[PDB]
Every structure is written in C-alpha cells, then in structure tokens.
Amino acid sequence: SHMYEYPVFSHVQAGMFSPELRTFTKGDAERWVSTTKKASDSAFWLEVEGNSMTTPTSFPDGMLILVDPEQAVEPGDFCIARLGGDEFTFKKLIRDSGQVFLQPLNPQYPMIPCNESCSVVGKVIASQ
Ligand SMILES: [Ca+2]
Ligand SMILES: [Ca+2]
Ligand SMILES: [Ca+2]
Numbered sequence: 760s761h762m763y764e765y766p767v768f769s770h771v772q773a774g775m776f777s778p779e780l781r782t783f784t785k786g787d788a789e790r791w792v793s794t795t796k797k798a799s800d801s802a803f804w805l806e807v808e809g810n811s812m813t814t815p816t817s818f819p820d821g822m823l824i825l826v827d828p829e830q831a832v833e834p835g836d837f838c839i840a841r842l843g844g845d846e847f848t849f850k851k852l853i854r855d856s857g858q859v860f861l862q863p864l865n866p867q868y869p870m871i872p873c874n875e876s877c878s879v880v881g882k883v884i885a886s887q
C-alpha cells in the first residue's frame with residue numbers, strides 16, 4: 760500500500776467575536792502531516808483552534824482535519840464553508856426540515872444557512 764502527507768495551512772479568527780469565522784494566513788505552509796487517506800492534490804490540513812465543534816464524533820482545539828476541495832459534499836458530511844466571500848467555517852452540512860444548514864457540534868454555537876453568501880470549499884475526509 761501507500762501513505763500520504765498533506766500540507767497544513769494556517770488560519771486565524773476573522774472578526775473579533777467570530778471564533779467560528781476563520782481566515783487563511785499569508786505565507787507558505789511549514790508543516791506536512793501524514794495519513795493513510797488518499798485524496799486530491801489540492802487536499803490540505805487545518806488545525807481546529809476552537810470548541811464550536813466540541814461535543815459532549817468531535818473536533819477539539821488541537822485536532823487536525825483533512826480538507827479536500829475536490830470531493831462533492833452532501834448533507835451528513837462535514838465541510839469547510841466559505842461565507843461573505845473571504846472568511847470560512849468548519850461545520851457539519853445538514854438538512855433541517857428540508858433547509859440546508861451548517862451545524863456546529865457544540866450547541867453553544869448558532870446554526871447558519873448555506874444559500875447566497877455561502878459556498879462549499881471542501882469535504883472533511885479525515886482527522887488526527
Ligand atoms: Ca486535482
Ligand atoms: Ca487553539
Ligand atoms: Ca457522499
């Protein structure tokens with residue numbers, strides 16, 4: 760068999776009170792994390808730096824999530840969604856009564872619609 764290793768990209772809190780909102784930092788990556796998971800060449804890792812995805816499946820501050828911008832995302836999958844055109848968020852894509860929403864694993868965070876100022880950047884396919 761064969762193993763893979765993808766770049767880990769940096770990102771920081773967008774707004775001042777928007778821990779869920781994140782923005783990619785400037786600069787190349789200096790960290791490459793391996794995995795058994797094979798993905799597209801645009802695949803990369805992100806470091807969970809908050810607790811909005813921390814449940815009572817869970818992604819605590821310090822966990823790495825592998826993002827693949829080349830795989831189709833559907834309700835039930837976790838993904839990185841882009842909002843406002845610049846910032847992005849890590850949520851679970853779901854269907855609440857037929858409506859498409861981004862859901863945080865931590866109930867202390869609000870759910871967001873994904874319609875106009877919302878597009879899907881990639882599927883989460885693995886974690887460390
Ligand atoms: Ca490609
Ligand atoms: Ca942190
Ligand atoms: Ca699928």
Ligand SMILES: [Ca+2]
Pocket residue numbers: 885886887
């Ligand atoms: Ca894992």
